[PDB]
Design a protein around this ligand. Sequence first.
Ligand code: HEM
Ligand code: HEM
Lengths: 363, 362
Amino acid sequence: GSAVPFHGAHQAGIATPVQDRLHFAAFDVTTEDRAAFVALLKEWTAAARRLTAGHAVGEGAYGGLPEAPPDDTGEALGLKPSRLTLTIGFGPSLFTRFGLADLRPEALADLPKFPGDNLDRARSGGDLCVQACADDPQVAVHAIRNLARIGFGKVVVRWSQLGFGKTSSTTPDKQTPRNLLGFKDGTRNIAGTEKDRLDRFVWAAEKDGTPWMTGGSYLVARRIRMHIETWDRASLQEQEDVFGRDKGEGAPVGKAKERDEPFLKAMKPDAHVRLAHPDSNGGATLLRRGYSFTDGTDGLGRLDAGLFFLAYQRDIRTGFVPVQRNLATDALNEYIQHVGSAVFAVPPGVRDADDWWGSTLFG
Amino acid sequence: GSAVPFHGAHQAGIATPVQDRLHFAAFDVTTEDRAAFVALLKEWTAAARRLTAGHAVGEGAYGGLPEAPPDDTGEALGLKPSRLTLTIGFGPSLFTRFGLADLRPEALADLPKFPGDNLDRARSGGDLCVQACADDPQVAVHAIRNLARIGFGKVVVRWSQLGFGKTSSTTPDKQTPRNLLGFKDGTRNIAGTEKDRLDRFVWAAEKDGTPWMTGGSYLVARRIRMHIETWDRASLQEQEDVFGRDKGEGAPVGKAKERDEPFLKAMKPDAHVRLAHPDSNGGATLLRRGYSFTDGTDGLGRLDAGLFFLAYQRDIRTGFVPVQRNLATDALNEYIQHVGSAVFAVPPGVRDADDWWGSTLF
Ligand code: HEM
Ligand code: HEM
């Protein structure tokens, strides 16, 4: 299909079909004035309604007064909506502003330091995020560029990441995508069709303790670099032993098919799948919605490439934290490094044409 | 999703329809052994035949000996060829090695300094380049990665540039793409069907004075930063005056349709199209084939944005040089800065399955 509806009980871009491309941006707030910030949220919501339907923002990209700047910067003219979704989230640091300190959710927990972390503070944190997903990267970039422009004077862009998954024009919808290590990635995940599993593991409930967040979720972002040239010198057996699945079919060891359920005892004790599996973590289960990246080459000639990992969950303390803690001895650690991090509370959806992003928090 | 044929009188990736994604790499050579370098060119050619057909390199991505590394890194398994083209070029610095000094073509000229240039030396130059273009970014990264792996110990990556979306056209029958300033870019180019114009302006000929380059071309690459804060506060009229075309349709000033011919005297004297047009430059004409980029933020609260400009021509001295010199007074200069530069000789095509990249030189 061509467009994804913007309105709902939940924000789109979480349980809705995974699009081919990502532009993720974190913003910092520069105003102290609550009223001015609320005004921005309303203007952003109006723009998002236009963008997700394939229309220009405000009065358009051309045809207005010649002596005024155009309302829309124009680089998406002639393109389709491209299944664009725009998903907003609020960082812990937002809650030190506007008198919000007592409304920070307990489920919006600060992450501990994990072994091997090497976080760049410039590419970590942020007061706000917008996740822009679409099948055409120019559609996603146009959205971020215009939201940043509307917000100028009240917010700045802290850090930005481009990503890619599959190319849907050429690649069947049911084929699992491969990551840049060459392994199928996504086999055992929560799918958007699994209503009950979403209620149990992804959406915040009223009884969880923070009423304004009912129908929202909690997001963890990790920029994870791969040591590509080291990995490529490893033997085939070493690579398969790191994961506990074979590289060609992606079946669990001792099984024949990708979707065969794993027998954890046949994998090495520090294999990634064995450590990450819910049965190893008291039942803890995540929705993964991440994207590959390749940014260029670094000063030594090496490929700057990896996984921009995104996980959604009902509570950070019972989702990402236990699972990542259990990866302390993962065989994969030799070939990766976490170099950026942030956490966000993703509010409930925009109910109808008169609602706006953050209305349950701000009133 | 289809394959583009690899063999021909010319390399693919020039007159070919422009693909959605770019991965460009420049390499420096680290061996002094001519025979070892020739062996690398042959192994690279064999890999390129596989990659452009959607097959894995060497003996494949899996099912070999458990105790050896796979020949192919595996991340393009199950993907279509996706119009992958691989185009190789040789930089001026290459000709200081392997006894090649007297074979350097005259048409491979060093560029002069241009006013406004702020060139980063680390993201400029290179002994050789590979341009990988495809509709799928994973297919393009896979090709560059596997070529670099095969070359370990003989070549190193100097610098690379990814392009997320095209800003050029060799197919006038299809929609012209927009750059990040919001204007159509590629209306008046050279089309892949225009055989006469390609022979006059793009392909090198025997009589030009370097026999080994017959059927090849010359490439200029310029990395250009865009001052999008400054641009986004300009009025609509200011933006249109800079180019000489309207923003919505992309028609020449005063006309109704994109593809109507420009009437240059109705444009401002410093308009980009007026200064760049062949009629303003003694007939000099280019094949433009560039892509947009964004590499994160600038550290000052804004998105970074630019255009990786690529031009092909029969002689650098009669193509890019005169046109860029004429852009000294361009109104666009207020909004852009050139921050990287490289030139390359692009050899002729790989004729058949016994031929190899660079065979006419070596
Ligand atoms: C570059 C980093 C990573 C790579 C390359 C990677 C790769 C993979 C692969 C190939 C699988 C098996 C196929 C599948 O079920 O998806 C897998 C499964 C999984 N990964 Fe990772 N992963 C990475 C990081 C992480 C992180 C940071 C977490 C959580 C903190 C995580 C959690 C999981 C989970 C929960 C599973 C599914 C296990 C199961 O239920 O069978 N992964 N990963
Ligand atoms: C960021 C840099 C640039 C931008 C945004 C830009 C934009 C444009 C636009 C919008 C057009 C009109 C549509 C078309 O015919 O393609 C154009 C035309 C053209 N540009 Fe540029 N351009 C840039 C840099 C350059 C450079 C560096 C050169 C060559 C040195 C160049 C050469 C041309 C030529 C030859 C034309 C066609 C003129 C004609 O025959 O009508 N441009 N450019």
